[PDB]
Design a protein around this ligand. Structure first.
Ligand code: SF4
Ligand code: SF4
Ligand code: SF4
Ligand code: SF4
Ligand code: FCO
Ligand code: FCO
Ligand code: F3S
Ligand code: F3S
Ligand SMILES: [Cl-]
Ligand SMILES: [Mg+2]
Ligand SMILES: [Mg+2]
Ligand SMILES: [Mg+2]
Ligand SMILES: [Mg+2]
Ligand code: NI
Ligand code: NI
Lengths: 268, 551, 551, 268
């Protein structure tokens, strides 16, 4: 049978958001592209290049007008008329706005497209902004993280395909199944936090007993996500805190890439 | 004659434009252009040295881990910190496993479709295809039945009319030379490769806390808490799990990727005679194993004018000869300051003024080593190891050559390695040797923990006055990487990354000398200027990463 | 005659002793003895009905899930609770996936070494072995290279002198009939089976909370919280993960286990002519799909005197004819009360007095159905489905027969299924049909959640006075299972489990009639009375579970 | 190379503890028996039966005297002179004591052998006891759970093989890496407990949000184990509480099989 079409455009991306798909297991990337969707445009994997791949994009935008899911990773640079990201001689913001016109659903995968992310941090050299800022009259589904667990994205697409609508979203348009709760409000080291059992330096006795990482700078108290439950890579037990390092807040605007690793979080 | 543009170049990381003048059916001149900039060096400026690695790791998610590791090494260099040996073992396991995933994906997902025609694979006889590999491979997934299932997946995709990633590929192009059967072999291996790379990244994840973008490093060592008897930390059960994934990588690497490398060379032997990018090569030693940031398992060095016999070894990441030679220019790049700059004194002031063939045409800077253009990456890395007389590298190359000999009746000499296929071979050799790095460093870790050393982290102190300069070298999947940190009054006053794809993809330099991508394209035959497959074949051999090149 | 004892019978669950009298090399009489008892029925008494399932699940860890599910069904029967349909879908997925693991492990890890000679496998030509399977299987892991790797693993183990689980096996026994090549095929598949059964239990774990011993049931439904949009609960991502494992089971089941069943039968045709244990067969319908504990996907029924044409269908777990016919006797068992007992009135009073050939010789009770001995399990289950005219069962049997016919030139008639090999075939057919159960019930669950039904649990009320009775039926991997609960003043006043291996392994009954294991052995040739492989072949075909039989 | 020998004897076992090995991944059961150890006696997997398997046991007890790890699952019934478990015509306790004489290390896998478990519960029909009770002169390493995660056992064996000694044990001779902490002192639903966010019945709103299961009878507050961190089956996210059901205390003597599912735990 025919498969639902997807158009993926990278702006100021590091490719980590595409790379998350190569760790996925449900579906694996090969089952994603052969069984779940038709990936009609993705420059990392496309056989065609140059004029042939721009042919693919325009053919797909017309053939699937109103039907495709548009996915964007990376921030969009608006400074100096868009020239900090130019593809086929034109600003990426124009490629994105054109594709957005015919999209059935629009997804910002990763913190960069969801809220500007690292590329918009500090002095923001390129005037990087989020996908929602470039598309003010469209509902953009935000799947933040740097990069998110790929199933935060894949189960959102699956909900659209299987049930005909997006999953339920919070007030930042993030799917509640993945971003509905603070990490600290579902973290297995909360008992240690409550007892005042804290690591003070990597390698110290409490750290080597798996105690809470709050005083190392853990941003779990101010970051929404599923990192402590869904975790990463589907092997079991793998997320930054479980490995021994504080959450940095990479999911959350104003936290990741703004606060120092060892800067303390506010606790609600 | 005519002028062509390839924009976007696909099946790379990031945003690349290639232009070529074609005269009498051959490329006569080329321009390489990185078309996206973020200003990552500026974003990290004025921060605490300890924070840099988490930010600059985001230079790239394909070569995740690498900028994180180079950044902590740069801060450690500035601060004069000796990394605990257990932290070295963990960093090394991560880098080696990451690089295994990286190279496999490059050969298959990024590069194979330059050489493999899926339409022709539909014409293959799966039994004949399996028979072709007898006495060439012992891999357990080369049966006619495996190949038939793969062929039916292609058939169904084509029949659906939704070709997706395969649409408008270069099927039937005259430069596609594989028989139907070998095309089918390659597609089956393309799919199988995805499982092997997933296992490689399970190794990375178990030590890094996730991948992409590990989260277990620190200026001073690692965040993993080693305690064989501890609940919730890096204990023997977790180490055993890591080992279970390390053990799953070898067979595919040795029996599939290594063999396919020889198979492609056997069917495309003219590609051993083109694609030379440089006559100078640089690599840094890698995988330190002592308590003082040295004793590397892989050697480094500098080759000048392709003379392996007189190369200069590099055994230390503090080698002043290496450090003092490195400069970057922006004469033909979209930055303001154009004279060659040593990276501790580097600037990155944007100055976009559009494309000019003779002026500025890229966001990539132009690196030189004592004023010369240099190729970095797997070809450099292999050639340096051969120059060093590293038996493991000699032997692994000989295994590839022996398959090539069995298939063609011809041999391969080192002179033929300065080429598009030689570059691919160097990458395969690296991936093979990395499996022994993994076994070696897992065992070293288990042994060291058993001696009672659970140390992983030395807390840094950062003087609040003074100016301190540090450089972190790393032999990344695409070649020598260096991060250059200046600390002044406790904070980062300058940060400059000189990345392997900067060396290779950078535009014409201060003296208008041509870098490796642009040089490698001179002489490329182009049968159809509207579909310049041959140009992309050579460019892909360098494994471009333009988020890396430009940052 | 000669008297032998086989104690322990290995490659079963639990503790079994088989004795045989042998006349001129032929078994003339046999005794089956369960040699371990725990008193699980007494342990669970005097507790809240809601607690029973967690306790009685520990009757058995091989057939984990089954006693848990029968126990909740029994309490729901007593209390008159209708289970939510989502809870049925989840219970059904668990049971089907569990049974997939269970059957695969029985054919390979428990049974194959009765039929397969590893010493002979070492003499095999791996290429000839692979060639034997052309046009017989499309499995992707039958190459010469796979088989050579497996052969070398066996060779290395034998060479070590540490044969472990293979030490002192029946290598070279005159009843080993496979050629070297088929022995090697079977060993390769034995190892491959372990991956498939692991995937089946990943399905179980994701709904059960772990396996062995699931922890997601309740009297009233299940403890899984269905919420597509919830963090930390059963959402779409978790369901997709479940599906990813369901999809991994079919290829091995269909292209390996199903094929090997036909291959073994083709080389052992005399085993179609022995091992008949009974003339009456019982199975219960299974996999309810409505809101009232019915509408089963698999049918049940009762066959008497092997007459499929006049069998009695059973379509409800409340069937009074089924309920009223079941009794157990302890005349020849180590319990005090010997007259046949209906299980709601059953006792389990230990009365061990040592072994007597004509007295008591087992901890297993002797079940009857309206006074007759009955075989339960996959042979009964397949025969009932054939009697019901279930096309899926006839088609699946026909696929096994077609492979057998290609190998032997002969067909198989239903009369030949009343045998050791017919019993094995019925188990394979079950495993194959269970894969469609899994797809059907996963799809049903996704669809029902999409309609807005997220209900999973109906909280019970348990009257604090009165006495009332319930029975929970379940078609387990080894056959019809029933748990019988009496509640008095709110607590369990009686609990009796009548388990499929109780039916088959029970000793001579109140009328001294012979049950299936003991009957099946009459006529068995025994070439070497010190090494009675032929007896164990027939006994293993029933998949004994003595923790189940005795409890 | 030669592999370290293991002798496995089942007493009043349900076989769930052996079956745990079939879910293991590091090592898988096939790699365990072909590479890690030599499994010189195990009745579930043994090709040999009857007199041949009893010969294997005798030969291994002699060849490997002083060198093998003895593993026992199931309780040992002492009532009526041992007749509730008879193998080859002798009480299992006699087989166990004989094999213990020559063992280099002795492991009780599962709650039944560690402390009597379900088989010793209620009225204890058979006078079932633990392995330690039948071997008073030996240090029995206890690996409780019903069944434990197989790697709680496998990593204990690996520590013996690799480092030449048992892992560190608590005062119940349980390995600290697996049993050193209460489940409630490392449970990701502790934030909900702390906030008074509790499921009251399966399927209720709080249950369907992943709230704490204390008021459903969770025994985490009084059970030592690694179920919330190591979890089960190596797929990620799988343990009883994460699936929606309270911990029953199956690891812990006096909790599992004694307290009712819905009976509340004591909280320290
Ligand atoms: S969100 Fe992170 S991983 Fe994704 S493009 Fe941005 S920097 Fe890269
Ligand atoms: S501060 Fe971090 S480690 Fe500690 S309980 Fe909160 S989220 Fe967990
Ligand atoms: S501990 Fe549990 S799983 Fe193990 S033998 Fe006892 S009842 Fe069975
Ligand atoms: S009571 Fe149970 S679910 Fe709640 S926090 Fe404690 S261990 Fe976790
Ligand atoms: N490998 C890699 Fe990325 C590049 N070029 C870095 O460093
Ligand atoms: N299957 C199974 Fe176990 C037995 N006999 C139960 O019920
Ligand atoms: S840094 Fe990011 S990946 Fe999760 S643990 Fe914190 S939100
Ligand atoms: S019942 Fe047992 S398996 Fe763990 S979650 Fe509780 S100790
Ligand atoms: Cl829902
Ligand atoms: Mg210190
Ligand atoms: Mg730079
Ligand atoms: Mg009748
Ligand atoms: Mg009973
Ligand atoms: Ni990169
Ligand atoms: Ni059983």
């Amino acid at each position: 049978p025919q498969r639902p079409p997807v158009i993926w455009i990278g702006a100021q991306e590091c490719t980590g958001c595409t790379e998350s798909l190569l760790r996925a297991t449900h579906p694996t990337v090969e089952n994603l592209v052969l069984e779940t969707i038709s990936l009609e445009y993705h420059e990392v994997l496309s056989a065609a290049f140059g004029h042939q791949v721009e042919e693919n994009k325009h053919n797909a935008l017309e053939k699937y007008k109103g039907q495709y899911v548009l996915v964007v990773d990376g921030s969009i640079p608006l400074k100096d008329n868009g020239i900090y990201c130019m593809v086929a001689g034109e600003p990426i913001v124009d490629h994105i706005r054109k594709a957005a016109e015919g999209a059935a659903a629009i997804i910002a995968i990763g913190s960069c497209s969801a809220w500007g992310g690292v590329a918009a941090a500090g002095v923001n050299p390129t005037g990087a902004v989020s996908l929602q800022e470039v598309l003010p009259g469209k509902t953009v589904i935000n799947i933040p993280g740097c990069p998110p667990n790929p199933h935060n994205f894949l189960a959102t697409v699956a909900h659209i395909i299987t049930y005909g609508k997006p999953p339920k979203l919070d007030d930042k348009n993030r799917p509640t199944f993945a971003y509905g709760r603070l990490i600290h409000e579902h973290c297995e080291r909360r008992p240690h936090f409550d007892a005042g059992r804290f690591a003070k330096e990597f390698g110290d006795e409490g750290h080597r007993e798996g105690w809470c990482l709050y005083h190392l700078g853990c941003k779990g108290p101010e970051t929404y996500g599923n990192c402590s439950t869904l975790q990463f890579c589907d092997v079991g037990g793998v997320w930054p805190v479980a490995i021994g390092h504080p959450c940095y807040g990479c999911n959350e605007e104003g936290i990741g890439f703004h606060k120092g690793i060892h800067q303390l979080a506010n606790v609600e | 004659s005519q002028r062509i543009t390839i924009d976007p170049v696909t099946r790379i990381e990031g945003h690349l434009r290639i232009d070529c003048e074609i005269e009498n059916g051959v490329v006569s001149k080329a321009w390489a252009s990185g078309t996206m900039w973020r200003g990552m060096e500026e974003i990290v400026k004025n921060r605490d040295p300890r924070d840099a690695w988490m930010i600059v790791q985001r230079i790239c998610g394909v070569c995740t881990t690498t900028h994180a590791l180079s950044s902590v090494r740069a801060a450690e260099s500035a601060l004069n910190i000796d990394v605990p040996v257990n932290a070295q073992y963990i960093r090394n396991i991560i880098l080696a496993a990451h690089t295994t995933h990286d190279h496999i994906v490059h050969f298959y997902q990024l590069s194979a479709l330059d050489w493999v025609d899926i339409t022709s694979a539909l014409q293959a006889d799966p039994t004949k295809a399996s028979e072709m590999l007898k006495g060439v491979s012992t891999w357990h997934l080369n049966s006619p039945e495996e190949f038939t299932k793969v062929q039916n997946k292609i058939k169904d995709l084509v029949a659906s009319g939704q070709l997706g990633i395969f649409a408008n590929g270069y099927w039937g192009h005259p430069a596609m030379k594989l028989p139907p059967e070998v095309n089918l072999i390659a597609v089956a291996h393309y799919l199988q490769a995805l499982e092997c790379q997933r296992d490689a990244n399970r190794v990375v994840a178990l030590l890094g806390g996730k991948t992409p973008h590990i989260q277990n490093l620190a200026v001073g060592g690692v965040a993993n808490p080693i305690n064989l008897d501890g609940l919730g930390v890096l204990n023997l059960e977790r180490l055993m799990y890591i080992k279970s994934f390390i053990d799953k990588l070898s067979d595919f690497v040795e029996q599939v990727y290594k063999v396919d490398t020889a198979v492609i060379a056997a069917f495309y032997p003219e590609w051993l005679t083109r694609g030379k990018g440089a006559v100078n090569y640089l690599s840094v030693p890698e995988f330190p194993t002592d308590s003082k940031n040295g004793s590397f398992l892989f050697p480094g060095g500098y080759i000048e004018n392709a003379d392996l016999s007189s190369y200069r070894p590099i055994t230390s990441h503090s080698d002043e000869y290496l450090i003092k030679g490195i400069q970057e220019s922006a004469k033909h790049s979209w930055y303001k300051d154009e004279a060659p700059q040593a990276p501790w004194e580097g600037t990155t002031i944007p100055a976009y003024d559009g494309w000019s063939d003779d002026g500025k045409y890229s966001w990539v800077k132009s690196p030189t080593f004592y004023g010369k253009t240099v190729e970095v990456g797997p070809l450099a890395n292999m050639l340096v190891k051969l120059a060093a007389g590293r038996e493991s590298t000699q032997n692994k190359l000989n295994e590839i050559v022996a398959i090539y000999q069995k298939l063609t009746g011809n041999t391969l000499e080192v002179a033929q390695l300065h080429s598009t296929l030689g570059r691919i071979i160097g990458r395969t050799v690296h991936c093979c040797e990395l499996q022994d790095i993994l076994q070696n460093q897992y065992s070293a870790l288990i042994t060291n923990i058993g001696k009672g050393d659970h140390t992983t982290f030395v807390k840094p102190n950062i003087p609040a006055t003074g100016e301190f300069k540090g450089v972190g070298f790393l032999e990344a999947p695409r070649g020598m990487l260096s991060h250059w940190m200046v600390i002044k009054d406790g904070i980062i006053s300058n940060y400059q990354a000189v990345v392997p794809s900067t060396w290779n993809s950078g535009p014409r330099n201060f003296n208008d000398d041509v870098g490796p991508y642009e040089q490698s394209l001179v002489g490329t035959p182009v049968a159809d200027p509207n579909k310049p497959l041959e140009v992309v074949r050579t460019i892909h051999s360098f494994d471009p990463c333009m988020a890396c090149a430009v940052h």
